[PDB]
Amino acid sequence: PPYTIVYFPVRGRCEAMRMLLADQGQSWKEEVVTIDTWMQGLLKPTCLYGQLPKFEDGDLTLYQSNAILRHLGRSLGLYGKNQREAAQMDMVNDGVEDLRGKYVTLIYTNYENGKNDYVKALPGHLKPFETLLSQNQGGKAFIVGDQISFADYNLLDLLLIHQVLAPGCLDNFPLLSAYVARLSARPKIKAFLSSPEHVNRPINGNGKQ
């Protein structure tokens, strides 16, 4: 520590880690970069891969949302109890990112004539996560263990942004519906979810959702 997130005023990718850092009682500092600020062309050239978020934790400066999500998982110990769980979780996040990536192209590239297509295909993508749950205490626990992990925050987020995009999507997946109901009811998360910092934040930075 201390924790500082650097990124455009949007939930985008950072909302997951914000939820993790909050669930785990940590306090971080937000450092907004508006598109206007970004266009100045001074900060971007410092960014390792020319993008954001840029996360700092003490003398350690990271990049890549997932690299960050995993570092938080190793540090706050939300990355499993054995090399086996670490695999299951990683197999889950890698899947989440895969889907989210599509969600990004849809919203920032072909939203108008793309949404109908993606909304129909969506179901096939959520089924695995439902299956994963069926195969663990009957979806009464978490995505991988009996404990929360970096992967759980990420999945909870993706499902939350998909409740905006394709309303009712999880109706046919009774476990994922439970999953979201519980995780969101977690005291610290519910606190965050009603937070003005989060409620006054555009899911994506172009006005489409």
Ligand X SMILES: N[C@@H](CCC(=O)N[C@@H](CS)C(=O)NCC(=O)O)C(=O)O
Chain positions contacting a copy of itself, by CB under 8 A: 48-50, 60, 62-64, 66-68, 70-71, 74-75, 83-84, 86-88, 90-91, 93-95, 98, 124, 128, 131-132
Question: CB of 75: closest distance to a copy of itself in angstroms?
Answer: 6
Backbone φ and ψ for 68, nearest 5 degrees, come out as -65, -45
Residue 65 assigned as binding residue: yes
| Both tokens assigned to 119 | 């909304």
* Residue 25 vs 50, nearer CB to ligand X: 50
Is residue 65 a contact point for ligand X (CB under 6 A)?
A: yes
Q: Find which of a copy of itself, ligand X, none residue 181 binds, CB within 5 to 8 Å per kind.
A: none
- Please choose which of a copy of itself, ligand X, none residue 136 contacts, taking the beta carbon within 5 to 8 angstroms, the exact cut-off set by kind: none
Judge whether 103 is annotated as a binding position.
Answer: no
Q: Closest approach of Cβ 49 to a copy of itself, in Å?
A: 6
Please name which of 155, 206, 146 lies closest in space to residue 179, comparing C-alpha atoms. 155
Residue 173's alpha-carbon distances to 84, 131, 164, 168, 176, in angstroms, are 26, 9, 16, 10, 6
Kindly tell me the sign of the dihedral angle through the C-alpha atoms of 178, 183, 186, 191. Answer: negative
- Cβ distance to ligand X smaller for residue 4 or 64: 64
Residues with Cβ within 8 Å of 30's Cβ and at least 6 positions away in sequence, in order, are 4, 5, 197
Nearer to a copy of itself, 65 or 204 (CB): 65
CB-based contacts of 65, cutoff 8 Å, min separation 6: 13, 14, 16, 17, 53
User: What one-character-per-residue DSSP string does 93-136 give?
Assistant: HHHHHHHHHHHHHHHHTS-TTTHHHHHHHHHHHHHHHHHHHHTT
Distance (Å, whole) CA 132 – CA 141: 11
What is the closest distance, in whole angstroms, from the C-beta atom of residue 80 to a copy of itself in the complex? 10
How many angstroms separate the CA atoms of 180 and 185, rounded?
8
64 lines the binding site for ligand X (CB under 6 A): yes
Check whether 28 is labelled as a binding-site residue.
no
Q: Tell me which of 29, 84, 87, 98 binds ligand X, using CB under 6 A.
A: 98
Asked if residue 193 belongs to a known ligand binding site, the reply is no
> Which segments are annotated as binding site for glutathione?
7, 13, 38, 44, 51-52, 64-65
Positions that interact with ligand X (CB under 6 A): 8, 12-13, 50-52, 64-66, 94, 98
